[PDB]
Design a protein around this motif. Structure first.
Motif, PDB file in Angstrom:
ATOM      1  N   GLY A  21       0.267   8.956   4.965  1.00  0.00           N
ATOM      2  CA  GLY A  21      -0.927   9.478   5.597  1.00  0.00           C
ATOM      3  C   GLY A  21      -0.601  10.247   6.857  1.00  0.00           C
ATOM      4  O   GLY A  21      -1.300  11.202   7.207  1.00  0.00           O
ATOM      5  N   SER A  22       0.464   9.854   7.548  1.00  0.00           N
ATOM      6  CA  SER A  22       1.001  10.632   8.650  1.00  0.00           C
ATOM      7  C   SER A  22       1.941  11.732   8.193  1.00  0.00           C
ATOM      8  O   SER A  22       2.454  12.468   9.040  1.00  0.00           O
ATOM      9  CB  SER A  22       1.737   9.724   9.633  1.00  0.00           C
ATOM     10  N   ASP A  23       2.217  11.848   6.894  1.00  0.00           N
ATOM     11  CA  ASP A  23       3.029  12.957   6.411  1.00  0.00           C
ATOM     12  C   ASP A  23       2.286  13.892   5.469  1.00  0.00           C
ATOM     13  O   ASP A  23       1.956  15.011   5.866  1.00  0.00           O
ATOM     14  CB  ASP A  23       4.277  12.409   5.708  1.00  0.00           C
ATOM     15  N   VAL A  24       1.912  13.441   4.275  1.00  0.00           N
ATOM     16  CA  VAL A  24       1.717  14.347   3.149  1.00  0.00           C
ATOM     17  C   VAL A  24       0.235  14.431   2.825  1.00  0.00           C
ATOM     18  O   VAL A  24      -0.414  13.406   2.583  1.00  0.00           O
ATOM     19  CB  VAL A  24       2.513  13.897   1.910  1.00  0.00           C
ATOM     20  N   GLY A  25      -0.293  15.650   2.813  1.00  0.00           N
ATOM     21  CA  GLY A  25      -1.651  15.880   2.361  1.00  0.00           C
ATOM     22  C   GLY A  25      -1.706  16.097   0.864  1.00  0.00           C
ATOM     23  O   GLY A  25      -2.788  16.145   0.271  1.00  0.00           O
ATOM     24  N   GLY A  44       9.328  14.726   3.872  1.00  0.00           N
ATOM     25  CA  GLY A  44      10.075  15.880   4.320  1.00  0.00           C
ATOM     26  C   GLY A  44      10.803  15.679   5.631  1.00  0.00           C
ATOM     27  O   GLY A  44      10.175  15.708   6.694  1.00  0.00           O
TER      28      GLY A  44
ATOM     29  N   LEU B  10      -0.358   8.964  18.655  1.00  0.00           N
ATOM     30  CA  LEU B  10      -1.221   8.707  17.507  1.00  0.00           C
ATOM     31  C   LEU B  10      -2.564   8.172  17.971  1.00  0.00           C
ATOM     32  O   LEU B  10      -2.643   7.016  18.407  1.00  0.00           O
ATOM     33  CB  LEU B  10      -0.583   7.679  16.565  1.00  0.00           C
ATOM     34  N   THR B  28      -4.217  11.268  12.209  1.00  0.00           N
ATOM     35  CA  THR B  28      -2.935  11.701  12.761  1.00  0.00           C
ATOM     36  C   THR B  28      -2.321  12.987  12.212  1.00  0.00           C
ATOM     37  O   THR B  28      -2.315  14.006  12.907  1.00  0.00           O
ATOM     38  CB  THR B  28      -1.918  10.573  12.567  1.00  0.00           C
ATOM     39  N   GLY B  29      -1.848  12.958  10.967  1.00  0.00           N
ATOM     40  CA  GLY B  29      -1.143  14.079  10.350  1.00  0.00           C
ATOM     41  C   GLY B  29       0.021  14.683  11.121  1.00  0.00           C
ATOM     42  O   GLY B  29       0.440  15.798  10.800  1.00  0.00           O
ATOM     43  N   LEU B  30       0.576  13.969  12.106  1.00  0.00           N
ATOM     44  CA  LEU B  30       1.455  14.533  13.125  1.00  0.00           C
ATOM     45  C   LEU B  30       2.793  15.033  12.619  1.00  0.00           C
ATOM     46  O   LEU B  30       3.263  16.075  13.080  1.00  0.00           O
ATOM     47  CB  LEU B  30       1.775  13.501  14.190  1.00  0.00           C
ATOM     48  N   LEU B  31       3.424  14.309  11.717  1.00  0.00           N
ATOM     49  CA  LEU B  31       4.841  14.464  11.453  1.00  0.00           C
ATOM     50  C   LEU B  31       5.077  15.618  10.480  1.00  0.00           C
ATOM     51  O   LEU B  31       4.244  16.515  10.331  1.00  0.00           O
ATOM     52  CB  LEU B  31       5.419  13.145  10.949  1.00  0.00           C
ATOM     53  N   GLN B  32       6.272  15.614   9.878  1.00  0.00           N
ATOM     54  CA  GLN B  32       6.805  16.650   8.974  1.00  0.00           C
ATOM     55  C   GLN B  32       6.738  18.047   9.595  1.00  0.00           C
ATOM     56  O   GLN B  32       5.859  18.853   9.283  1.00  0.00           O
ATOM     57  CB  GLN B  32       6.214  16.598   7.541  1.00  0.00           C
ATOM     58  N   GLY B  34       8.705  20.466   9.094  1.00  0.00           N
ATOM     59  CA  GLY B  34       8.802  21.475   8.057  1.00  0.00           C
ATOM     60  C   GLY B  34       7.544  21.510   7.207  1.00  0.00           C
ATOM     61  O   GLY B  34       7.309  20.618   6.382  1.00  0.00           O
TER      62      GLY B  34
END
Lengths: 48, 48
Positions: A21-25, A44, B10, B28-32, B34
């Motif tokens: 959820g903090s990485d991939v949509g 990633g 966060l 959040t969506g913070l990371l990645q 790339g």
């Protein structure tokens, strides 16, 4: 299936829990409900 | 608080962090760092 899978590396004394959820949509759906279809969850470049 | 590029606290401080229209505990969506490759950017025609 938001925030459903989560990697948590343990260091020698500490730990850092990330989550998709903090990485991939991008969200692999359970439909293709027809059996044996496997899924993927890419992380990633997890810089720990 | 640090010069680490990915960290951007966060659901940050004292303000509740809710517009009244997001309706989640998750923002959040913070990371990645790339992001995936863009097919609407400047190099779109060559990729297409």
């Amino acid at each position: 299936s938001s925030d459903d899978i989560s990697m948590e590396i343990e260091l020698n004394s500490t730990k850092f829990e990330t989550i998709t959820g903090s990485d991939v949509g991008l969200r692999p759906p359970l439909y293709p409900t027809v059996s044996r279809e496997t899924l993927a969850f890419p992380f990633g470049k997890l810089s720990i | 608080t640090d010069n680490n590029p990915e960290g951007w606290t966060l659901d940050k401080s004292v303000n509740n962090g809710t517009f009244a229209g997001l309706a989640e505990n998750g923002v959040t969506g913070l990371l990645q760092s790339g992001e995936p490759m863009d097919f609407s950017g400047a190099n779109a025609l060559y990729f297409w």
